[PDB]
Ligand binder design. Structure first.
Ligand SMILES: [K+]
Ligand SMILES: [K+]
Ligand SMILES: [Mg+2]
Ligand SMILES: [Mg+2]
Ligand SMILES: [Mg+2]
Ligand SMILES: [Mg+2]
Ligand SMILES: [Mg+2]
Ligand SMILES: [Mg+2]
Ligand SMILES: [Mg+2]
Ligand SMILES: [Mg+2]
Ligand SMILES: [Mg+2]
Ligand SMILES: [Mg+2]
Ligand SMILES: [Mg+2]
Ligand SMILES: [Mg+2]
Ligand SMILES: [Mg+2]
Ligand SMILES: [Mg+2]
Ligand SMILES: [Mg+2]
Ligand SMILES: [Mg+2]
Ligand SMILES: [Mg+2]
Ligand SMILES: [Mg+2]
Ligand SMILES: [Mg+2]
Ligand SMILES: [Mg+2]
Ligand SMILES: [Mg+2]
Ligand SMILES: [Mg+2]
Ligand SMILES: [Mg+2]
Ligand SMILES: [Mg+2]
Ligand SMILES: [Mg+2]
Ligand SMILES: [Mg+2]
Ligand SMILES: [Mg+2]
Ligand SMILES: [Mg+2]
Ligand SMILES: [Mg+2]
Ligand SMILES: [Mg+2]
Ligand SMILES: [Mg+2]
Ligand SMILES: [Mg+2]
Ligand SMILES: [Mg+2]
Ligand SMILES: [Mg+2]
Ligand SMILES: [Mg+2]
Ligand SMILES: [Mg+2]
Ligand SMILES: [Mg+2]
Ligand SMILES: [Mg+2]
Ligand SMILES: [Mg+2]
Ligand SMILES: [Mg+2]
Ligand SMILES: [Mg+2]
Ligand SMILES: [Mg+2]
Ligand SMILES: [Mg+2]
Ligand SMILES: [Mg+2]
Ligand SMILES: [Mg+2]
Ligand SMILES: [Mg+2]
Ligand SMILES: [Mg+2]
Ligand SMILES: [Mg+2]
Lengths: 89, 44, 64, 94, 51
RNA sequence: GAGCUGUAAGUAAGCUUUGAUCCAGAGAUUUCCGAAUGGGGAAACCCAGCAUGAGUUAUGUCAUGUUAUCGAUAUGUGAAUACAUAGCAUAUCAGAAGGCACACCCGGAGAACUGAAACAUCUUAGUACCCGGAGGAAGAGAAAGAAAAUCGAUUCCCUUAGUAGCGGCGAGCGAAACGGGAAGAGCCCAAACCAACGUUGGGGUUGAGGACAGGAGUUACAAAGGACGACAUUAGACGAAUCAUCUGGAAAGAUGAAUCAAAGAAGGUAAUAAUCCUGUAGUCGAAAAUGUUGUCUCUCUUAUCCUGAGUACGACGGAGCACGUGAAAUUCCGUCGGAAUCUGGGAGGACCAUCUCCUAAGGCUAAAUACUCUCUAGUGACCGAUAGUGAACAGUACCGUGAGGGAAAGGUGAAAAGCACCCCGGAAGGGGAGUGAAAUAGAACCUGAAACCGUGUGCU
RNA sequence: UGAGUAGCGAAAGACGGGUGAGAAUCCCGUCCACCGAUUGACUAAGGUUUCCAGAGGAAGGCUCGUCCGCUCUGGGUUAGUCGGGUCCUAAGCUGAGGCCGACAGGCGUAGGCGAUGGAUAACAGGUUGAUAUUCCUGUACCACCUAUAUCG
RNA sequence: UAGAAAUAGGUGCCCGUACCGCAAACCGACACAGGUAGUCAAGAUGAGAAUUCUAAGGUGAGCGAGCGAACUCUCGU
């Protein structure tokens, strides 16, 4: 289930600035806790995790012509590595 | 001057929410009427 | 592929499910980093997993 | 009943009387693209492209193998297979 | 209890009920003694015996 | 049987004659809320117990199952209290809950405006609303009947008949039997009485009978199953016959000459097509599932006593009967009283006598009948965008705390061929040049009336 | 039509420089002026992306607009200790059994839910375009777990 | 009451967290002279959180330019 917990890496200027400090940002499944995220990261990337910070993002109002709607709600986890490194690219 | 509507999330949910409607036969009648008419929104 | 799956032992089906889920995970990470561009591989692996779980359930229902 | 690669005669439209190979088939719209038939001039932004525009399938007709006259096509069975056959002659269509 | 009409001398109609003459006695229901409301006419009939 | 990855263009990356997309039958998967049921809760969320399993030295975390209440069964255990019971714990069952087109149906409960030219009896009306229960129908049903020469369960249609009658005899309300039809079906108990250890079997079921002395069937009349066949439904397949010229952007139109027809229904195709396409008449077709069905089978069968008791019935108060308590029989409810036992009992519109018909106080029963959210196939001297659904593109937008109210909005062209390129302009917008039959068909796109707004000027 | 009419919603602006097709209205600067028991700062409710950056100027903005709480594209909210839950109860709501009621239902025992109150372990500094007692640095505390020697 | 340590190392979940917030974002159909709970409380003067001017900090109010008639409104003599 570890590969169901982690959906995708988040690559932004802020997330790259965090990567410079050995912090890796992932979009995760909205139903998981940060302990599950830590275990999933450890299982997938064979690294040691110092800590996990997690946050929720509300759906964003969005439109395409007369069709207004929302984006999906998101859960964002920032994973601080104790040892190892993650080669996303 | 103070107007009639002073919004309150808790008050609104407790008086008009889904569970309050389910709590009485007439509230369930409201839900049935709104389902029959085809409303997108059945309650708060 | 259902014919090819049908010739594998139950444990092998489980072994292929795990490795297919690993390849699918890798494809998503490549896509999110703008490095895949071969986007049809995602649906192929997804349906293969579906087929693998379909047969596993079929045999787990013939045994019981 | 009209397939890609077929030799067809155009029996209605501007190019009525011309023959050509069926380049493409659009079964959902019931239209075919016939080489050299219904040439459109489109204004390409990044010249004037000249290419075929589809015409309705009912405006083309197959030509009989023997008489080389337009023919409607029926169907017959030979060893569990459906084969196009001409109405005018009855010989199987390629 | 049945519903009917109370009728005035001018025949004005008003809805009314006719209640049974229920009396609270113990009748040993389903083997177990139990105080239940039972009509006096039922007690006269004899289907239900008290105590 | 060649394209395909929805609407739905666009690429990108792919799938597909080693048979894809697609259609039908059957399977598998099926998050969370919701009766929602482990507990809570402001629905789609939060928090747990127990058992089992991952993981970790270990805790934290996770996975899977299970845990509502009331019923049901069966194992204990235990009060006041001695036996007991109430109660309590545990296992097993998975019976109920909630929803609806809930339109038709049965029941409980039940208005008012209104009419009476006021109004109370009466009417609206046992209607509207509310509540309960179900079914594909429901209800009714096998004479204590209709009647007055006899019929023979119920229901429904016609008629009787706006009659008889009811009615502040006002306004109004308003039958039934006979006759003609649709459909058609009859049955099971309780009792006496036998066999056995009061409870089970046997027996019996009515207008005088009972006690005693192969043919019928799962549609009631008892109830579970199999074999084979049939048909139909849910995908589909085949399916006759036209060419030429003219005008046109385009022919199906006109003209000339042909053909098919169990097919001249219809729709499409660049204008109006029986013969171009999809079809039509007609014929063919099912691996699978679902029905309805026939045969075989398979089942079952060969007046001494009794005859429904707190009943019938009666008084008082009400209700239902077309009928308002009246000459009011007939049916039901509350309260109170309260029979008879084939020499019996009930009805025939108060009541009595005779006569005649029937045999209450237990139950079951198809069909003819009611309705349509639906499905399949069709139809219309029905609408054609202010019409027709509120809605051709929406119970949306919007309004309201909420219940709730509730719009506007269809058309380029045959085909996007949707205007390359040049010029003014920041753009918008234009003038050319092209496409097109047409661009005053350029997307605010068929036609483009009137109000209204401008420019020019013949007379004034 | 009324009609280029009424209005354009409490107030102090001036100039320089810039940008631009276009500037009283945008940016920057200096001077001037207004609030200051507040026109300042921080919490709560309520709203729900309006926040940040880059690009834009049809519509919206009572004028203008190069600007914007407007449009396009891409981003932004980090907690063992803050507030709430895994703690507690009040009013009130609900309520196994239970009592009552034509139906529907009403009431109520144990119990439960329920803060506006009770309990409860983290502080200072730094840092971004946008977060910070949450991130980083420094120094702590609390609960549980394990390892190396009475509880009630 | 019945009843039946230090030290070292490790672990610590969910929800909220942007922004406005006495308002241009909340309630008032509006970028509306209104309504909106609590907290922080500088200096001069003063009894004072009155008054006037200032600090911190914020702001110049989303139409302007002239003219300086009647009349209307607010203000002074
Ligand atoms: K055609
Ligand atoms: K924050
Ligand atoms: Mg957090
Ligand atoms: Mg649920
Ligand atoms: Mg639940
Ligand atoms: Mg619950
Ligand atoms: Mg059960
Ligand atoms: Mg159950
Ligand atoms: Mg129903
Ligand atoms: Mg029902
Ligand atoms: Mg009247
Ligand atoms: Mg009901
Ligand atoms: Mg019902
Ligand atoms: Mg055919
Ligand atoms: Mg044909
Ligand atoms: Mg022709
Ligand atoms: Mg009898
Ligand atoms: Mg009556
Ligand atoms: Mg009567
Ligand atoms: Mg009478
Ligand atoms: Mg009588
Ligand atoms: Mg029109
Ligand atoms: Mg309409
Ligand atoms: Mg043009
Ligand atoms: Mg132009
Ligand atoms: Mg031009
Ligand atoms: Mg043009
Ligand atoms: Mg024209
Ligand atoms: Mg037009
Ligand atoms: Mg005007
Ligand atoms: Mg003027
Ligand atoms: Mg005027
Ligand atoms: Mg004036
Ligand atoms: Mg003015
Ligand atoms: Mg102003
Ligand atoms: Mg001042
Ligand atoms: Mg901004
Ligand atoms: Mg403007
Ligand atoms: Mg914006
Ligand atoms: Mg209660
Ligand atoms: Mg009761
Ligand atoms: Mg509190
Ligand atoms: Mg900030
Ligand atoms: Mg903040
Ligand atoms: Mg603001
Ligand atoms: Mg303003
Ligand atoms: Mg304001
Ligand atoms: Mg205000
Ligand atoms: Mg003071
Ligand atoms: Mg002051």
């Amino acid at each position: 289930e570890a590969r169901d917990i982690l959906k995708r890496p988040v690559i932004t200027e802020k997330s790259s600035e965090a990567m410079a400090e050995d912090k890796y940002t992932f979009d995760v499944d909205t139903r998981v806790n940060k302990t599950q995220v830590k275990m999933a990261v450890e299982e997938i990337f064979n690294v040691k995790v110092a800590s996990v910070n997690i946050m929720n993002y509300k759906p964003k109002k969005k439109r395409m012509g007369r069709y207004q709607g929302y984006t999906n709600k998101r859960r964002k986890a920032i994973v601080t590595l104790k040892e190892g490194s993650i080669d996303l690219f | 001057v103070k107007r009639t509507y002073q919004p309150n999330k808790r008050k609104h949910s407790k008086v008009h929410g889904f569970r309050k409607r389910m709590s009485t036969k007439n509230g369930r009648k409201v839900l049935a009427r709104r389902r029959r008419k085809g409303r997108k929104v059945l309650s708060a | 592929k259902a014919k090819e799956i049908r010739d594998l032992t139950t444990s092998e089906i489980e072994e292929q499910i795990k490795s297919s889920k690993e390849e699918l995970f890798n494809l998503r990470f490549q896509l999110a980093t703008g490095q895949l561009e071969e986007t049809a591989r995602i649906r192929t692996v997804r349906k293969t997993i579906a087929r693998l779980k379909t047969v596993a359930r079929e045999r787990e229902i013939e045994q019981s | 009943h009209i397939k890609k690669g077929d030799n067809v005669k155009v029996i209605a439209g501007k190019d009525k009387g011309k023959e050509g190979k069926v380049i493409a088939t659009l079964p959902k719209k019931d239209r075919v693209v016939v080489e050299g038939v219904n040439i459109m001039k489109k204004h390409q932004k990044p010249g004037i492209l000249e290419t075929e525009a589809a015409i309705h399938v009912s405006n083309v007709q197959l030509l009989d193998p023997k008489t080389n006259e337009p023919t409607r096509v029926g169907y017959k069975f030979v060893d569990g297979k459906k084969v196009r056959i001409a109405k005018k002659s009855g010989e199987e269509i390629k | 209890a049945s519903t009917g009409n109370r009728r005035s001398h001018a025949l004005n109609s008003t809805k009314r009920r006719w209640n049974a003459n229920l009396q609270k006695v113990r009748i040993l229901v389903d083997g177990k003694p139990k105080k239940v409301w039972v009509s006096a006419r039922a007690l006269k009939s004899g289907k239900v015996t008290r105590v």
